[PDB]
Amino acid sequence: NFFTEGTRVWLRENGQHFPSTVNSCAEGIVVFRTDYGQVFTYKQSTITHQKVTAMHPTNEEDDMASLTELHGGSIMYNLFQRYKRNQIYTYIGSILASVNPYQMEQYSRRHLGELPPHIFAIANECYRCLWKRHDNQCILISGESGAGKTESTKLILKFLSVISLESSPIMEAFGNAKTVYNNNSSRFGKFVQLNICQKGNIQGGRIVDYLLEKNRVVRQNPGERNYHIFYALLAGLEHEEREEFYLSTPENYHYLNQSGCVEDKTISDQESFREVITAMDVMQFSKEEVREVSRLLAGILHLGNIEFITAGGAQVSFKTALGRSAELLGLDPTQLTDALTQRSMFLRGEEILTPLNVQQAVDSRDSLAMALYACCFEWVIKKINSRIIGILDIFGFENFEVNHFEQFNINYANEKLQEYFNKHIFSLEQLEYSREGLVWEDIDWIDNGECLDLIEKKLGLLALINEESHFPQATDSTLLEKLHSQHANNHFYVKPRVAVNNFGVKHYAGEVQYDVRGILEKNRDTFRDDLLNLLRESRFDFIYDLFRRPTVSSQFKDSLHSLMATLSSSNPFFVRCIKPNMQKMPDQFDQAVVLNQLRYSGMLETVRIRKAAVRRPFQDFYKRYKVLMRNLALPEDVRGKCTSLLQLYDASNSEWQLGKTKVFLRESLEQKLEKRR
């Protein structure tokens, strides 16, 4: 394991392989200098036989899968060099990795592989396969917002338009929100079906939306905001309309203040308003309908200020919040105040009014707010679709220090998407081995069905959550214990030793720890029918135009299943967008951020699966292992020379094979040969 001064090596330190150079090797001490500027010193005796792997035909300068040692450090280094000191691309098998940085004819008609990686190459393959297979295509653009997903969508669409955006401000206003880790994060999946006629010319588009984070409408964690649109509305409305809807600053609203977001600057919120209003005009929303959208949002804001007094059961005792809400929605004050505090049932055939408690009233109020928002959101999408190869803009795995119900849903969605991806790749692999390579049988390895089951199957995490929610004395604490009682004896499911982080799920890309706190309340979503009937009865025409125990988690499950049906009925193409640095710096590659991004987008695990595996050109193999052939009577041809050595290790010819240009061998055989070399 000794390497001379200047040798290029991989150093497996702290759990990651570092691209390094041997700085010095004297007095039994070895010093390594990494390409990231770190200096590591060791006793030469402690440097074990790999451990330190030498840079096999280095390639210090289009597809990551072509790397022989296919691990984290290699992926990070290769993406880095291409991005910083080489033209940006890059492929990871079928996946197109796109790294954000500094702000058609040639691709048209070409094959996927003949051209340098580019969003156009993916767009072309999709256009291609669409006509060839007579089959709908999906281009799944994953990664966190800001990573460059809208640019990828823009150019895929620009491309399809050629060879054959105005709504963005709208969708961001209602679908995006500032989280702790991202100022403008999409909290829903957007699928823009680019429609083509019989002659493959673009005729229009149809937006479908999934996975809307309903919980955010009524709850925000510290340093997070509700959907952008609320802040945009409050910052952008003119004095006259603001006064008409009884609106003041965001601090005055329970649905906007509870988080503790410092923010200070409206300015961007005011710009976002201008942008939304312009987009809605393009989208053919009438002045009247826009004002109705804002009246409904303002209604949601005032609704959330409604306070209940625990008279025992409860009652509304306040001149406002409710008065303004009833005025905006055009519903009777007493009829609304009554239904906010009571539940209706009819029995053969008389009405039975039962009082609600304050906690039930609050939950019902929130469910109403979420219901109104979700339907308003759907109404707006209907309008966009009316005005106007599906491009899915979806988030990757989301992992903060403190993970709740929101992240759990996101990661659940990613497990489902990853299953589709894995099955797709495994299918492409069988086909490549059939037509590409002769072989008797093929087996697929890496099913994440178990993780998906742990999440969505009966007695799963979400199911138990629904269960606990319908029990009157249920709590996050008892739900935690039900999780442990049900799963601690199985799964991908772990519990923190000191009950600080709460349950952990071994997801596809990594273990995530979720805190149980808030899961029950966020999951509750039982809207009261009588409250909705009151709303249905009033009109400025928009409000009514919205036409056991329902929970957010179950609705998320349903929406996710709807999304997968839409995707599964197409042929998927994958683009992973990563944010290379946290400061919007032009062509700047922060290794810490990049590593996190690549992992979150499933790339690193996809690489590990692909790596599962060793191959070298005949001469490369012969030149590396020539030492091991000293005592053999070798033939004149290189293929024969490789065979001579390999036959000693496995005469059955099963642990190795000779291809057209390369020697293929199992990891175990390579490990055996290397140790001996």
Binding site: M345, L347, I352, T354, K458, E467, H470, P472, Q473, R548
Partner: protein, 313 residues
């Protein structure tokens, strides 16, 4: 493909699928044969009307309740209730679901209707699942068997429960029940109220009876329900629900003033009783069979060829 929660009381039988509101179908649970000879062709007339039509055509029948004080009288009529209900009402197949009952039944319905599983939850316990509390003593009294079950969180104490104008014709008795419905109220202080009741001031409200007759009842209007406490009036010695708990627009604060006198001092006693209470039990069952995970505490058919009549408990 749904599952069905069906509660048999001496009611007013209630039926409706696994959630989410109230029974789809409610009716008085009676079979009545025609006590006379019929002569208007067809032959037309049914051998026996079940509810609800048997509650629409009184006077030409002899009402016979299939159950009576908890134990049912005979499954010959009960089965007919069932078959009639499942087949010609809810329009539900027999193999649709595993069913859930409250309390020969299990077996007869098992061989006839072939519901591939079974589970029987007690009528009292379910009454907690209404407002979704975990603790409490449940006082469930319906025609014609009441019960008093104390449950702690979350296990349940089993042994601490103690279970207690001419209108001659059977059919006509139904009308009496209706005069029980509207024209009723439990006093707060019976003994002092009885004196002033004699005063000319009408504490009497006049109800009108399905024919022509107008009947004016007072006094006894509040006396009759009072029987629930002080059940000497019937000639039964077992003391009132009042005392059995410790051991109508009147309740619960009647129950309150009665208890606080019998209960120990310095103890706060909420007597919480919802509106909508008539369906409380059912709102229980829906919550139950829809909930994970006690589905695996059922008894399906494969497990009924081994033990059969046993294992149910």
């Amino acid at each position: 493909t749904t599952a069905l929660v069906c509660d048999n009381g001496s009611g007013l039988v209630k039926a409706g699928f696994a959630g989410d509101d109230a029974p789809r179908a409610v009716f008085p649970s009676i079979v009545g044969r025609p006590r006379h000879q019929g002569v208007m062709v067809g032959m037309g007339q049914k051998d026996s009307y079940v509810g609800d039509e048997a509650q629409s055509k009184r006077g030409i029948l002899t009402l016979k309740y299939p159950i009576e004080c908890g134990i049912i009288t005979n499954w010959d009529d009960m089965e007919k209730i069932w078959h009639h209900t499942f087949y010609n009402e809810l329009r539900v197949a027999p193999e649709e679901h595993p069913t859930l009952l409250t309390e020969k039944m299990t077996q007869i319905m098992f061989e006839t209707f072939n519901v591939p599983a079974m589970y029987v939850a007690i009528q009292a316990v379910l009454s907690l699942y209404a407002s979704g509390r975990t603790t409490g003593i449940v006082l469930d009294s319906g025609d014609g068997v009441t019960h008093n079950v104390p449950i702690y969180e979350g296990y349940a104490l089993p042994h601490a429960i103690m279970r207690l104008y001419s209108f001659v014709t059977t059919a006509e008795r139904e009308i009496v029940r209706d005069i029980k419905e509207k024209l009723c109220y439990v006093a707060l202080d019976f003994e002092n109220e009885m004196a002033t009741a004699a005063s000319s001031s009408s504490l009497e409200k006049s109800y009108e009876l399905p024919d022509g007759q107008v009947i004016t009842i007072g006094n006894e209007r509040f006396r009759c329900p009072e029987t629930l406490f002080q059940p000497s009036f019937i000639g039964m010695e077992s003391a009132g629900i009042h005392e059995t708990t410790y051991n109508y627009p009147g309740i619960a604060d009647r129950m309150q003033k009665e208890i606080t006198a019998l209960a120990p001092s310095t103890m706060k006693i909420k007597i919480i009783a919802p509106p909508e209470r008539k369906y409380s039990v059912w709102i229980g069952g829906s919550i139950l069979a829809s909930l994970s995970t006690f589905q695996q505490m059922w008894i399906t058919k494969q497990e009924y060829d081994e033990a059969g009549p046993s294992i149910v408990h």
